[PDB]
Amino acid sequence: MSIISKCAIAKGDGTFSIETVQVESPKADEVLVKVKAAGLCHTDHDSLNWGKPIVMGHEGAGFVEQVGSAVTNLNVGDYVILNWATPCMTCFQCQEGNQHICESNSPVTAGTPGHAHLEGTTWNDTPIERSFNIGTLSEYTLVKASACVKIETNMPMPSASIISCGVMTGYGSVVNSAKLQAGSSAVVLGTGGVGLNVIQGARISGAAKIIAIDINQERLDMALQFGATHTILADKNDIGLLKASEDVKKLTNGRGADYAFECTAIPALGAAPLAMIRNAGTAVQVSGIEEEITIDMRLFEWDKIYINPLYGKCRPQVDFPKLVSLYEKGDLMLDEMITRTYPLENLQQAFDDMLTGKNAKGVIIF
Amino acid sequence: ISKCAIAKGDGTFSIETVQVESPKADEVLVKVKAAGLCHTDHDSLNWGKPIVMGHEGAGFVEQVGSAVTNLNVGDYVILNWATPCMTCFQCQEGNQHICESNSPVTAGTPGHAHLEGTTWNDTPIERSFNIGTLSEYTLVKASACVKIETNMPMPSASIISCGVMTGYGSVVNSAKLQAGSSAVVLGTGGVGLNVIQGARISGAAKIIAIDINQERLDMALQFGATHTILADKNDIGLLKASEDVKKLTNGRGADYAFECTAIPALGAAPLAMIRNAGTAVQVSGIEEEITIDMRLFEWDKIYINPLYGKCRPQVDFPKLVSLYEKGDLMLDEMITRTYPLENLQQAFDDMLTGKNAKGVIIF
Amino acid sequence: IISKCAIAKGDGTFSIETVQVESPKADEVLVKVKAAGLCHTDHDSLNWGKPIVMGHEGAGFVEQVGSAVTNLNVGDYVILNWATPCMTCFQCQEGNQHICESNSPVTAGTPGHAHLEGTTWNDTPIERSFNIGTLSEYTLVKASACVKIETNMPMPSASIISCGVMTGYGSVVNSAKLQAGSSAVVLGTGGVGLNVIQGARISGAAKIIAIDINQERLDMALQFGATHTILADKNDIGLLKASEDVKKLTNGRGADYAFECTAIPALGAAPLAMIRNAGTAVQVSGIEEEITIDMRLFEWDKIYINPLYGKCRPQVDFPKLVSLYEKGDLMLDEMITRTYPLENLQQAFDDMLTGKNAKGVIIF
Amino acid sequence: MSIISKCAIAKGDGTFSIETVQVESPKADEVLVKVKAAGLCHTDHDSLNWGKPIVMGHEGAGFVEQVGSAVTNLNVGDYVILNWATPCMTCFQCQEGNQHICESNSPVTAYTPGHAHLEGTTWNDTPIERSFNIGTLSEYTLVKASACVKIETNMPMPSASIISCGVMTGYGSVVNSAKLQAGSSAVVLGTGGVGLNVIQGARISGAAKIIAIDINQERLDMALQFGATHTILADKNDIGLLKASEDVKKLTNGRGADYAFECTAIPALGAAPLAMIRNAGTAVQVSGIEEEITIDMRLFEWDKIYINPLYGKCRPQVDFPKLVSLYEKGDLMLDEMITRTYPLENLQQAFDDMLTGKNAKGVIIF
Ligand SMILES: NC(=O)c1ccc[n+]([C@@H]2O[C@H](COP(=O)([O-])OP(=O)(O)OC[C@H]3O[C@@H](n4cnc5c(N)ncnc54)[C@H](O)[C@@H]3O)[C@@H](O)[C@H]2O)c1
Ligand SMILES: NC(=O)c1ccc[n+]([C@@H]2O[C@H](COP(=O)([O-])OP(=O)(O)OC[C@H]3O[C@@H](n4cnc5c(N)ncnc54)[C@H](O)[C@@H]3O)[C@@H](O)[C@H]2O)c1
Ligand SMILES: NC(=O)c1ccc[n+]([C@@H]2O[C@H](COP(=O)([O-])OP(=O)(O)OC[C@H]3O[C@@H](n4cnc5c(N)ncnc54)[C@H](O)[C@@H]3O)[C@@H](O)[C@H]2O)c1
């Protein structure tokens, strides 16, 4: 059995075109997922500029169409949130509980056995790769079972999809990485797909003061909606947001916030959470920078914890169900995150709306 | 001259008059506008000597001591009973709540104002927990005063002095409750409802309220509970309530459980409500001898009996008013009734019989 | 394959016997046992009402490896563990492999036991104690019971890692997270408590006060890392006089950490008497009885915890323990009082009952 | 009562001369210390090119000569280890326990309270500062009572004096700042005054691997004496110590060490501990860098705690007695540290030997 799927294919020239791909039947450890909605992340745009053909998409949710012989805890028709940890569960990092940095199956750490067998998905009869081992921007996906989280809820499929990246890295960086203490102060630099979810984490965690900083006013109105207490509108020409840092310091009685989160997608702002933070504060850079930047090392000075975490320290079988609860409870808002849905043929307009500043998140729906 | 409620070692209280001296150099004269009630004030009658009752209070600074730098006449203050010295072992560890020299609990004393300061008849009498808040005017050590620059209801600020701090802090400062977790509160009263608030502020996804009175249970839902359990008096060690708790937690148990029923015989009951490797926080404080089945402790369970929610008064108190100003801490709703000093007995009855979440004595 | 094994009865007696141990299935492993340490839990196994191949402490060589166990090979060197973690359940994904809800011989009792007719006595299948049953020439265990190690060290000293060393060292290092420069008190300096002393010594405790009724145990406590000793009286209830001696050596106040490992249920709350307000009290023994506790002793920020097997994550913890031994800081050799033939197992009990032997290892 | 005191004085120009200062009698919150031994830290050389006359010295110990009328817990003749925290015990940082980054009194993080009155020490009729509030390279130093920790022992004074900075920051970085856990792997970049005490702290904490790296074979020889298990000789052209970093990964199963500590006084090596570290490890640069540097941010990538701690999170009344207790037990080696004692006049040679690597620690004896 081979199935044909329309999908978004990125080519290795900065370009993406809707194509069709051939999805084989699941192997014993794999699962064929009918995708109902695929959310879009800033990393998905970056994927075009990677130099490989890939099935784009790393935020997805849907239903289990087929299951393999070895998979035992999930069934045809089951409702499944996709994750890109693909944890092997046995390696050194997995035994520390760091399944998000798995040494053998992570798409980031190992680039694998978190990917499904390559012949499972084919583009003009040449095997191609599922981005982050899941390639959600696709009618069907053949992934391994570690990529699936079963939830049993009537939650909207667009709301579910966004947990696969934006919501998890945002919330988990706050809760799992920084381990933000209730009653503290937090600064968020970049209230976008991730940063807005940082705010929900800070809000849900009990932060008393949540300082949203962005260059776009709509983004900031979004930050107010999702929990922010104070708003600062940064000028992009301000290098390192040092001028914003003085404004934060006025909001924290001279000394700075207790916590600060980077998620601007600007490599130059890598150190800028250090500028916003009190000595002994914790500075979390969520973006991920792979370039060579210059840092005034005075910003590091004086017991400030700095971490570049991945995927909010995600343990998908454990974290995803916790996020689902807070939604049902009402403390996660993710229906309201979904500003627009797009047909896969309109992915270009979706990319444009994420970068222009007009969407909290965009979900392609099938 | 001040109207104050004096406890008598015979076990009775009587409104009565005391004369208060001007402040010494490191002391503050605080006119009390509100004196919240706490369970231990009831047990403070059952102590063996006379005192000035009260360990929850708030007011304005009528008079300031010569070396007191950070406060001024007319400032607004919430009283705290930690009165930390800032120099002993525990204080340098950061445990200002178990101050080895000034604490009314662990050194009971410096940190209590000069004894001449409050005289009844002509015998100097002690202020309860060093502050004696059930008084019209109190003289106290400066370390027992926490200034606020916002303007909030005086009954709201007074309850911060004990119930709010112990309950919130046991969640935040002691248990260090993590978001997404399941919470069980045994006894949802003045401490218990702020445990719940502490749970909801910290982000708990499930908050199970167990209580023998439905009107608190109703209060518990007002203040953030997600599930309510009406226990029965004769459920020894609350075993049957444990079983419904585990039914609500997929088996296992809760990740956190909190005891504050004031019953000595339920001191291990948190361990029954909670999963292995969970953290059980007994808050009521038991000085009695009880029998415990040590199969409840078993398998990585973290037990603790913290005091005053690990209170560092000049840090946690400003935090609590910020979350009241944000709207996450509910304290105006917790003042079910205000009472004058003379109607104090009706206030114990309303608290002890479930009719108050918290009762405050206003001046 | 025939295995001469110690088989416990429900009555309270044992006999040496012979059993067939079948070839390994896909997820399980056949181990030729070279050394099996002993404890009072093995004596308890006679009390329990079940036929059982006894032994929960083991080290050996792999003789047979199943189709799906490609992470170790034949001839590899293997320290056995009794957590047998399933690796995917709630506690395993929290990092609590020692309290696995699906495979633990304690918390689940089962997967984590090899397939039942693997080891058969006459033709009735018999369980291996704690899913491992090490007092046997050959044992069939899941691969989870096996931790490859890659040092040429003496098998007997490898066998005491399987229990006394992991629970004692781990009660200090993982469960208490003992901070260098602190004061430690150890109540019961025996099979468990000597590796609690060893664990305080490696973590940097500045003052380690050993308390025990036997003078021989105290001397062997100094040898294993202690700095102070106090001799204790059984007539002391709650060790309250030993607690006030502890307060003299700890500036008033108490010790920053204390540890229960005496085997006495009436002593369950004693570490709390040993400890300053806001210290941490660790009850390593496990008490399945109801006792009376003076509740003032919990009062005031004292962390009280009874942990299992020292928070064991065997594939993680065991290699680290092997590394400290290689470094000289961890002492396993001097901990083995005497070696005994399986056929002289009653000797061992006998000498454990008397208190002659801190630990006994049966070597094949 | 004005005492004359021989001392070392840095002049702004990088030049040091022994001079005499008139040292005034103690005010109510002050203590006058007859310094008996004063060790040399790398920071004192740097203290030369600060553009201000200064009485040098921030490692020191002695006996109390005169006590102020408010000082109640110190008496003439007491044996005092000096510290440079001088904590006020009530500001925001002190009340979180961070006495070493005191907002009111720290010489680093705030002339300041915690310095004696300016008329107390004068050079040529003009008031002068004491470096790090204590200026220990002087026969007598006037300091605040909070500079003083009384020890009730009979330790060698040279051995007690190096606690004032070198031992405290190196051990503290491991125990207090990094909270190093036993059985771990640990890499130390620079085995000098701070780095050898890093190794001691790693050894007292129970590290299973302590890998020592330096460009000087003799200082590598010292690390083994104080606790290192493996040793890597790096070259001075190894930019960022990346090949040193390959040897480390060879020693740590290819993943990297759990912990790595940077104390080379070389700014470009600020990010080097990240290169020594496994993902989710903790990297600590104790040096302290004031210049801007260039950093490839994939070195931060993936859960890596980075922290620039000050003074090993020293609470001097709490930490200094633990150090003395661990000297009694034998596990802090610090008689061995004092490779050389010098007169005040041969400070230059003490400087020269610290910088050449011929000393572990060198102490000026008065
Ligand atoms: N560590 C991880 O696991 C992980 C996961 C997901 C995404 N990311 C990365 O996080 C970053 C953000 O992701 P996203 O989906 O939220 O992107 P996004 O484009 O949707 O949001 C970025 C926000 O940053 C704002 N911004 C840009 N420059 C700014 C400036 N100078 N000052 C203030 N705000 C500024 C933008 O206006 C926007 O609001 C990306 O780099 C992405 O690759 C990392
Ligand atoms: N640790 C501290 O520092 C500290 C501080 C303040 C108060 N306390 C103590 O906490 C305890 C409660 O404090 P409070 O002011 O809220 O008193 P309270 O009377 O308001 O609370 C008592 C609650 O216990 C509940 N209860 C009684 N029996 C129960 C049972 N079998 N099962 C379930 N619930 C039961 C009742 O519903 C009642 O609401 C007291 O013992 C008090 O002394 C301790
Ligand atoms: N929690 C776990 O996972 C785990 C694992 C293994 C063992 N254990 C238990 O830990 C306990 C330790 O037993 P063990 O292996 O060390 O056997 P053991 O006989 O060697 O240890 C008991 C020690 O306590 C001493 N002692 C007796 N009375 C004392 C007293 N009043 N005061 C001070 N010391 C006294 C004894 O003389 C002896 O030295 C056992 O109960 C064992 O079942 C628990």
Ligand SMILES: NC(=O)c1ccc[n+]([C@@H]2O[C@H](COP(=O)([O-])OP(=O)(O)OC[C@H]3O[C@@H](n4cnc5c(N)ncnc54)[C@H](O)[C@@H]3O)[C@@H](O)[C@H]2O)c1
């Ligand atoms: N943060 C604080 O509180 C604090 C405290 C004390 C010292 N310091 C600073 O720590 C740093 C070290 O202090 P120190 O007294 O140990 O200096 P030191 O000169 O005595 O020791 C530095 C060692 O690092 C070695 N080294 C130099 N370059 C190297 C390289 N490329 N690769 C490997 N090793 C190299 C040197 O050979 C020397 O052995 C100084 O910069 C000092 O200012 C900071």
Ligand SMILES: [Zn+2]
């Ligand atoms: Zn993404």
Ligand SMILES: [Zn+2]
């Ligand atoms: Zn893995």
Ligand SMILES: [Zn+2]
């Ligand atoms: Zn109270």
Ligand SMILES: [Zn+2]
């Ligand atoms: Zn104190």
Ligand SMILES: [Zn+2]
């Ligand atoms: Zn055993």
Ligand SMILES: [Zn+2]
């Ligand atoms: Zn498991």
Ligand SMILES: [Zn+2]
């Ligand atoms: Zn220095």
Ligand SMILES: [Zn+2]
């Ligand atoms: Zn301060």
